[PDB]
A paper describes a structure:
Next, the crystal structure of the P197T mutant in complex with BS was determined. In contrast to CE, BS interacts with T197. Remarkably, the efficiency of accumulative inhibition by BS increases in the P197 mutant by approximatively two-fold. However, for BS accumulative inhibition was maintained for each mutant, and for the two P197 mutants the affinity of BS (Ki) remained high.
Acetohydroxyacid synthase (AHAS), also known as acetolactate synthase, is the first enzyme of the branched chain amino acid (BCAA) biosynthesis pathway, and is the target for more than 50 of these commercial herbicides. These sites are mainly focused on just eight amino acids 1 with all located in the substrate access channel or the catalytic pocket of AHAS.
Author numbering:
A (entry chain A), B (entry chain A): 86 to 667
Amino acid sequence: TFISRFAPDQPRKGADILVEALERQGVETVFAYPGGASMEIHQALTRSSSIRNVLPRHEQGGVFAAEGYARSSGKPGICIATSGPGATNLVSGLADALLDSVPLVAITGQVTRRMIGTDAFQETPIVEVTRSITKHNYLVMDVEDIPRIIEEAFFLATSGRPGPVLVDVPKDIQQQLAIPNWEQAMRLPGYMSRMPKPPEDSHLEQIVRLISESKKPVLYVGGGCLNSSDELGRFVELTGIPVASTLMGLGSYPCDDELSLHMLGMHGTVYANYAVEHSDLLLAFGVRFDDRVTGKLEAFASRAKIVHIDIDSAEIGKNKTPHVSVCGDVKLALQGMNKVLENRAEELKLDFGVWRNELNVQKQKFPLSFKTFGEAIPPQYAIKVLDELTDGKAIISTGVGQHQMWAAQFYNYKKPRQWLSSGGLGAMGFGLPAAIGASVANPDAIVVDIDGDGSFIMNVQELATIRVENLPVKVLLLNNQHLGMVMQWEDRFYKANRAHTFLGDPAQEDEIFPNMLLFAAACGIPAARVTKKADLREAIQTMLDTPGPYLLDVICPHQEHVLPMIPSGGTFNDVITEGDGR
Amino acid sequence: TFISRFAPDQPRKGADILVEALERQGVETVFAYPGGASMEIHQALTRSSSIRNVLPRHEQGGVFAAEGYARSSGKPGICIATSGPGATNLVSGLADALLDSVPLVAITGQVTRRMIGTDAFQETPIVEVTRSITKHNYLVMDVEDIPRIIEEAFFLATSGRPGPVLVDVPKDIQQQLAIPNWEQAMRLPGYMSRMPKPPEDSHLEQIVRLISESKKPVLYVGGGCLNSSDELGRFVELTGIPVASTLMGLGSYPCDDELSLHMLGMHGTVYANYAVEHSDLLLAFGVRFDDRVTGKLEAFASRAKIVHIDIDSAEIGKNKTPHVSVCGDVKLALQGMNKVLENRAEELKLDFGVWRNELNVQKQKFPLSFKTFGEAIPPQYAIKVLDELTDGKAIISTGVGQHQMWAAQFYNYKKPRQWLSSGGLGAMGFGLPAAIGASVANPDAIVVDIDGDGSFIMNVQELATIRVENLPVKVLLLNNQHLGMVMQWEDRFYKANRAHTFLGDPAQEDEIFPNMLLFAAACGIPAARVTKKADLREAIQTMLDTPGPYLLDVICPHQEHVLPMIPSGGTFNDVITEGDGR
Ligand SMILES: Cc1cc2nc3c(=O)[nH]c(=O)nc-3n(C[C@H](O)[C@H](O)[C@H](O)COP(=O)(O)OP(=O)(O)OC[C@H]3O[C@@H](n4cnc5c(N)ncnc54)[C@H](O)[C@@H]3O)c2cc1C
Ligand SMILES: Cc1cc2nc3c(=O)[nH]c(=O)nc-3n(C[C@H](O)[C@H](O)[C@H](O)COP(=O)(O)OP(=O)(O)OC[C@H]3O[C@@H](n4cnc5c(N)ncnc54)[C@H](O)[C@@H]3O)c2cc1C
Ligand SMILES: COc1cc(OC)nc(Oc2cccc(Oc3nc(OC)cc(OC)n3)c2C(=O)O)n1
Ligand SMILES: COc1cc(OC)nc(Oc2cccc(Oc3nc(OC)cc(OC)n3)c2C(=O)O)n1
Ligand SMILES: Cc1ncc(C[n+]2c([C@@](C)(O)OO)sc(CCOP(=O)(O)OP(=O)(O)O)c2C)c(N)n1
Ligand SMILES: Cc1ncc(C[n+]2c([C@@](C)(O)OO)sc(CCOP(=O)(O)OP(=O)(O)O)c2C)c(N)n1
Ligand SMILES: [Mg+2]
Ligand SMILES: [Mg+2]
Ligand SMILES: [Mg+2]
Ligand SMILES: [Mg+2]
Ligand SMILES: [Mg+2]
Ligand SMILES: [Mg+2]
Ligand SMILES: [Mg+2]
Ligand SMILES: [Mg+2]
Ligand SMILES: [Mg+2]
């Protein structure tokens, strides 16, 4: 039973109704940067005893923190910004949350209703701007609509295929007094009628039928399974089907497991892509057949009967056409199939040991590998050490590029929501703010941002946030002085012709530039650099053991390449397994 | 006569046609951050001998630098970004260029034409996103359209009311070979037919008629006069009409002049707003009657006959209704009126010395003023010293907030395009990147970014750009540890209740946090802090005299308030002339 801070017959500002609407949704933390058009909302926030604000240093930091909070917890992330430049600074995070299906509620102040459309001070038509990069959005045109719109926004952000919802609030509405009605019905008839039903036995029985008729089945699991860890693990017990995972799926099934093929796709393992190439049954659970995974679609799982279970009917049959499909929550489908697989266990007698052995041979002939050169630190190796000293139990966020691939390849995620990474939009500068949100949501966890030097500098101002919020964020900075992934493509496809990929100072080209230790020092954050592989284990242990935030600058030879690699639009037969920038 | 690097019968990549299209427009400098979907464009850029790239550390830095380049030079600023997160990171700069009418051409890489609409890797529907915040934009659907679209984009960005134009280029189009045709006609029939004619004598003669019948005329000049410095100065010679200027107009008429009323509006001088309040003729040249200037519209220039000259007919009669108008280039109108005023000089005998004296009394009773407390540095005073040691000849860029108002109030701009400031959107984080673009366009000028500690940290990563580009950018950081302007409004309208406006570390609240000197040190930029007013003159001289970039952290009491202040929607009779946070 909720207790308002206001008498139920007492008028209060729209801003106060908006904050109480958040309290009534269970919101505990928001990421809010104030300005003129949201001041009223900030004033109302100080009157709340149950909502904490984490002040970022840039609204892009605020929205990426909100995403970290959501991805690391399964709760919606809440960001708040002023009008105009506040709102436009959210845009990369909105697009990012929409592409990765992350639940987010973004609230923007706006000029007054009578000023809308007049090229007013700090006016942006943010509802127009963000229509194509949000799941839904709203312009509040009457203070009495605030309760319903906030309720609809959380409902839409968190139900179905999750995503971002933006709510735009004119300053005059924030100031208007009213008595809220907390019992209005949501006004979403179409969306609620198009919500998937629980899966039917008919369809689940057909999937189990297909499994029992198959000799080479592969599971293809993605971000849709992040709430299905238990059900999926049980399903693999009852079937012994080996598991390939997308970049968004990492940790749905444990990486340190004998049935795990690890990641498939452009930079997937040779054995994961082999499994899919030669499978005769493809169980695609919570995946969207993106071409970073599939390569050339006609060549992808070309001898497989394809089962697709997705909560979004628009995904089913979009790129690849399944033989069987379920439109619904993969968690319910797994539960239902598990009962069938348990009851008919002795009748079914499922054994894929011959397929599993065929894959385990590929696993032994073509494992993930890296070279050690003299005493230079291999980035791959630094991530393996971090895995060992954290016992695969850290929350890992990353930037985008080679280090992101290595954080996926060389750390064994044990649970979903340990891995926080921008996959569909691939936004640099995500890792540090995302780690801020993850640490706020999981204040007892080990939180490590595995970052690149180009990604890290983009939202470096959030080091200040980490300090004043006294968050124990660890930064494993893999520093190769380049835009590594663009550099790799220059090496393989442009004859190593460099086009603006070097991030250091060309006037002193053998100096580490910038000196990231001084960024940390500027914000009172302990830091160290490590250059020799022999010093790595101790350096990483110091970072872990030192209380509070810590930056470790890990210097890496820049000629490393992420392998394997299927070029864009290619087939398994195109996989590249050797080479680097030397 | 232009010399291609390609034979005129030789096919080359669309990327190479795009770069040569820029060369043919006279482009010398671009601000380009590479990614996968723009790599081809970056490769083609390295093949150009005439185009230099300035690599920013964040695309928001790139676009704000492009704006600095444009505002400081009168040329279009050119920024280039990859697809997806590259493109979304431009958005605040696009909206900013559209609100301040800054010419800008933004080029974004895009996924291939067949991938558009498939939720592809790093795909953003950027043409949809930016339609309402650009003057125009384009999606290139055929390599043969590149010459025409680039020509149209520069034409639209620079003609008429200038603004940003975005061009979105699919990666397959960048790779396609073709032979460009450099002689296609622009396809802009409607826009070119709606282009204003040279002003008619009928309308110019009526304006001079009104002047000669007036006893209290005021000039109200804005960003539209930035190319009319000579004509406007001559016009003031022939008429002796005193000049009030908007924040975007600063320097069109010299600040250090006896006829200058300085800035009008919410934070205008008492005498400028008085002049307008009591005028009987308002000459509104290159201004858009924004309500940061007008306050309550009915009360604004309520006894004046209003003349409005604007290049955009949509502005004429929008907010205030003129008695006379010219739709056209204010530079041509001034030239035309100057001939009339010269020929009929002895017949007209214009003398407003009685009005000018009435204003000069207001100038003496209510000048701009500040308090000095002990040995604390007044920010107002620090800007006056900078004015003196630079002889009012520096290019000044700023962030947004109190320091922005003080940079407008206490520096005497002598020419247009010395002042680079975000006025309509008011985007924090603009000052440092804008100074980068200004220094690249004016490599011999004194370039000073007068910044606040909240604005400065937002794009602090561009310190790296300044270093490797070896740009002599000076940073006068006015550091009050707060979001000053939001703090001021908290003081006057919310009983000093602080809602997330303190930027320092509350655990050690009397320490300067962060330590901006270490940000500069991280990027190899000389820096110093100054805290005592007696040390200010020397500290600023050191910054000016030390070659190359330099950061000066100027510590300021946070209780300062920008005065005067007409509250939003108010009238002259509401002006606030005293008070602060003490
Ligand atoms: C540099 C770089 C390289 C990359 N290379 C690779 C790569 O080699 N391999 C790779 O896998 N990725 C790679 N990507 C990531 C990539 O672009 C996509 O982000 C990823 O492939 C898509 O993940 P997904 O298929 O799991 O779909 P998601 O984006 O995770 O979407 C989840 C899907 O499940 C559905 N869903 C959600 N909830 C449920 C539910 N309860 N029940 C049923 N369905 C549900 C949604 O409707 C959607 O279809 C790379 C990214 C970058 C930046
Ligand atoms: C914190 C803050 C406080 C502010 N307070 C103030 C304030 O007290 N005073 C103030 O003035 N501003 C203030 N502003 C700035 C403000 O919001 C607007 O940016 C400014 O008032 C508008 O400038 P402008 O009228 O010159 O129009 P601009 O934005 O400069 O537009 C120029 C106008 O001229 C036209 N034009 C362009 N070229 C030509 C040409 N060749 N011939 C004819 N017409 C042309 C365009 O069509 C347009 O109508 C403040 C901003 C901030 C961030
Ligand atoms: C905190 O410092 C400042 C400064 C400033 O102008 C310099 N504005 C704002 O808030 C706004 C932000 C955006 C639009 C605004 O316009 C506005 N808002 C109103 O809300 C009631 C009324 C109004 O009357 C014109 N104008 C306003 C505004 O508060 O005027 N805050
Ligand atoms: C499927 O076939 C194609 C063809 C093509 O251009 C011919 N583009 C794309 O998608 C992209 C979309 C966006 C960026 C792209 O470049 C890119 N993609 C990467 O995927 C991980 C990495 C990378 O590193 C530089 N560049 C690519 C890219 O496939 O080149 N796919
Ligand atoms: C906001 C933004 N701008 C540009 C991007 C385009 N990309 C990339 C890619 C893969 O999307 O190909 O396009 S990755 C990348 C370079 C990575 O820099 P690093 O972290 O310091 O080095 P690391 O050694 O790769 O770990 C760029 C420039 C991007 N995604 N986001
Ligand atoms: C991207 C962005 N986010 C928030 C903004 C809303 N505003 C402002 C305003 C005037 O637009 O009122 O809204 S000014 C301001 C605080 C200024 O920080 P400072 O430079 O360190 O301190 P100074 O002492 O004022 O010089 C904020 C938070 C903004 N405009 N841009
Ligand atoms: Mg605002
Ligand atoms: Mg069947
Ligand atoms: Mg080793
Ligand atoms: Mg790097
Ligand atoms: Mg790209
Ligand atoms: Mg008349
Ligand atoms: Mg003094
Ligand atoms: Mg930044
Ligand atoms: Mg400040």
